[PDB]
């Protein structure tokens, strides 16, 4: 319960940190030419390596 309260309190920070780092890695896979769909870009941007 205390961890869930802290994760809720700091959720905005953790989400900013997640979004800040999730797109910083060089993935050759998602180099602009072969990403045929907006959904694939959205899914990649929702993942952290």
């Amino acid at each position: 319960d205390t961890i869930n309260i802290l994760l809720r309190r700091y959720n905005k920070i953790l989400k900013n940190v997640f979004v800040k780092y999730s797109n910083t890695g060089f993935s050759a896979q998602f180099s602009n030419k072969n990403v045929n769909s907006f959904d694939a870009i959205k899914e990649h941007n929702s993942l952290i390596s």
Partner: peptide, 8 residues
């Protein structure tokens, strides 16, 4: 790769 829940 983690989703936001995996990152939490």
């Amino acid at each position: 790769s983690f989703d936001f829940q995996g990152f939490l």
